[PDB]
Enzyme design. Structure first.
Site, PDB file in Angstrom:
ATOM      1  CG  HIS A 206       0.185  10.358   7.238  1.00  0.00           C
ATOM      2  ND1 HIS A 206      -0.810   9.650   6.577  1.00  0.00           N
ATOM      3  CD2 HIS A 206      -0.102  11.674   7.077  1.00  0.00           C
ATOM      4  CE1 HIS A 206      -1.657  10.513   6.040  1.00  0.00           C
ATOM      5  NE2 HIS A 206      -1.261  11.742   6.341  1.00  0.00           N
TER       6      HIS A 206
ATOM      7  CD  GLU B 287      -4.235   9.587   2.915  1.00  0.00           C
ATOM      8  OE1 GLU B 287      -3.927   9.522   4.128  1.00  0.00           O
ATOM      9  OE2 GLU B 287      -4.786   8.659   2.285  1.00  0.00           O
TER      10      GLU B 287
ATOM     11  CG  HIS C  58       2.693   5.783   6.071  1.00  0.00           C
ATOM     12  ND1 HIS C  58       2.388   5.651   7.410  1.00  0.00           N
ATOM     13  CD2 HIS C  58       1.606   6.383   5.505  1.00  0.00           C
ATOM     14  CE1 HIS C  58       1.175   6.142   7.640  1.00  0.00           C
ATOM     15  NE2 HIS C  58       0.686   6.603   6.500  1.00  0.00           N
TER      16      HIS C  58
ATOM     17  CB  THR D  99      -6.156   8.032   5.843  1.00  0.00           C
ATOM     18  OG1 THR D  99      -4.839   7.541   5.632  1.00  0.00           O
ATOM     19  CG2 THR D  99      -6.150   9.327   6.666  1.00  0.00           C
TER      20      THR D  99
ATOM     21  CG  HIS E 184      -1.720  -1.244   1.431  1.00  0.00           C
ATOM     22  ND1 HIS E 184      -2.719  -1.652   0.569  1.00  0.00           N
ATOM     23  CD2 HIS E 184      -1.661  -2.185   2.402  1.00  0.00           C
ATOM     24  CE1 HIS E 184      -3.248  -2.784   1.003  1.00  0.00           C
ATOM     25  NE2 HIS E 184      -2.619  -3.133   2.110  1.00  0.00           N
TER      26      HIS E 184
ATOM     27  CG  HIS F 218      -0.945   8.589   2.104  1.00  0.00           C
ATOM     28  ND1 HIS F 218      -1.753   7.475   2.078  1.00  0.00           N
ATOM     29  CD2 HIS F 218      -0.600   8.757   3.406  1.00  0.00           C
ATOM     30  CE1 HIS F 218      -1.881   6.988   3.299  1.00  0.00           C
ATOM     31  NE2 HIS F 218      -1.202   7.750   4.133  1.00  0.00           N
TER      32      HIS F 218
HETATM   33  N1  LIG Z   1      -2.511   6.606   7.051  1.00  0.00           N
HETATM   34  S1  LIG Z   1      -2.607   6.655   8.657  1.00  0.00           S
HETATM   35  O1  LIG Z   1      -1.470   7.405   9.159  1.00  0.00           O
HETATM   36  O2  LIG Z   1      -3.916   7.065   9.030  1.00  0.00           O
HETATM   37  C1  LIG Z   1      -2.396   5.000   9.276  1.00  0.00           C
HETATM   38  C2  LIG Z   1      -1.475   4.764  10.282  1.00  0.00           C
HETATM   39  C3  LIG Z   1      -1.442   3.495  10.823  1.00  0.00           C
HETATM   40  F1  LIG Z   1      -0.583   3.246  11.841  1.00  0.00           F
HETATM   41  C4  LIG Z   1      -2.250   2.474  10.406  1.00  0.00           C
HETATM   42  C5  LIG Z   1      -3.121   2.762   9.391  1.00  0.00           C
HETATM   43  F2  LIG Z   1      -3.938   1.773   8.953  1.00  0.00           F
HETATM   44  C6  LIG Z   1      -3.227   3.999   8.795  1.00  0.00           C
HETATM   45 ZN   LIG Z   2      -1.008   7.638   6.183  1.00  0.00          ZN
END
Ligand SMILES: NS(=O)(=O)c1cc(F)cc(F)c1
Ligand SMILES: [Zn+2]
Ligand SMILES: OC[C@H]1O[C@@H](O)[C@H](O)[C@@H](O)[C@@H]1O
Ligand SMILES: OC[C@H]1O[C@@H](O)[C@H](O)[C@@H](O)[C@@H]1O
Ligand SMILES: OC[C@H]1O[C@H](O)[C@H](O)[C@@H](O)[C@@H]1O
Length: 257
Positions: free
Chosen positions: A116, A103, A91, A195, A61, A93
């Protein structure tokens, strides 16, 4: 099963994860004119000096840079937060083109990408327990725009060729996440969710106002990753972002006057 394609993307997620239509989903559009200064916010503290990175993983992903969260090292405190939140991973997006990829949006404007930095509330003992709590997580979000290169990102870019496909990982020790921040810590904050599936409503979002600049060459290397595993037909890892969701009964607060 879930992904970002026409047949398994954000518009399908609610069938397996009905909270996708819930009351505090993320991301959201940040209307800067309606966002209000909040004097109850305390100074924000990003304390990453002793961070211990371990590994980088392509999970099909995105890619996660993982940290040792077995003790208090890299932590986030202050601002809207009660107590101490430990860094577990970061990570990104990103888009297929520079005009989309974030996002969160700012007055509907989409950035090229969004970082993030994910943290869990230490009063709950482990990440798994934290995602059973309304205040279990804090995610620090940082926008990326395309311009000059970000020197502190280059180590990430240069390892991506070794984790091209889903399930591949590589050692990623001695990486300093301080090199991914902008100068200013001005931010917006609101209560939201993960998200991606499972879309759990556990997150205090802290979204920095100042974007970082990365070069076109840096983001182009993100776009060479693959969603698929080794040997399988190539599907470029691009457009791995969820669009903005309804704000519902929420207010976005600003740290700055
Ligand atoms: N993309 S996010 O930062 O909301 C996120 C973080 C996480 F630890 C696990 C998830 F499934 C999604
Ligand atoms: Zn994220
Ligand atoms: O190696 C990345 C970072 O790791 C941390 O644990 C060290 O304390 C920092 O000095 C270093 O910059
Ligand atoms: O009742 C007035 C209050 O309304 C709330 O919705 C706002 O968040 C507060 O800032 C304001 O003081
Ligand atoms: O800091 C993250 C990584 O950066 C570079 O790839 C280094 O060669 C490697 O040793 C390190 O783990």
């Amino acid at each position: 099963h879930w992904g970002y394609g026409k047949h398994n993307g954000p518009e399908h997620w609610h069938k397996d994860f009905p909270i996708a239509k819930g009351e505090r989903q993320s991301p959201v559009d940040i209307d800067t004119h309606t966002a209000k200064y909040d004097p109850s916010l305390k100074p924000l503290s990003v304390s990453y000096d002793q961070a211990t990175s371990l590994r980088i993983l392509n999970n099909g992903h995105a890619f996660n840079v993982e940290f040792d969260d077995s003790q208090d090292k890299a932590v986030l405190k202050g601002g809207p937060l009660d107590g101490t939140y430990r860094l577990i991973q970061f990570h990104f997006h990103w888009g297929s083109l520079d005009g989309q990829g974030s996002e969160h949006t700012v007055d509907k404007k989409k950035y090229a990408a969004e970082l993030h930095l994910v943290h869990w509330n230490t009063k709950y003992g482990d990440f798994g327990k934290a995602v059973q709590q309304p205040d279990g997580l804090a995610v620090l979000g940082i926008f990326l725009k395309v311009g000059s290169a970000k020197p502190g990102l280059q180590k990430v870019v240069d390892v991506l060729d070794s984790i091209k496909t889903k399930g591949k990982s590589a050692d990623f020790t001695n990486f300093d996440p301080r090199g991914l921040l902008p100068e200013s810590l001005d931010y917006w904050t609101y209560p939201g969710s993960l998200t991606t599936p499972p879309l759990l409503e556990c997150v205090t979002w802290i979204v920095l106002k100042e974007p970082i600049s990365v070069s076109s060459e840096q983001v182009l290397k993100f776009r060479k990753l693959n969603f698929n595993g080794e040997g399988e037909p190539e599907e470029l890892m691009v457009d791995n972002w969820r669009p903005a969701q309804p704000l519902k009964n929420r207010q976005i607060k600003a740290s700055f006057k």
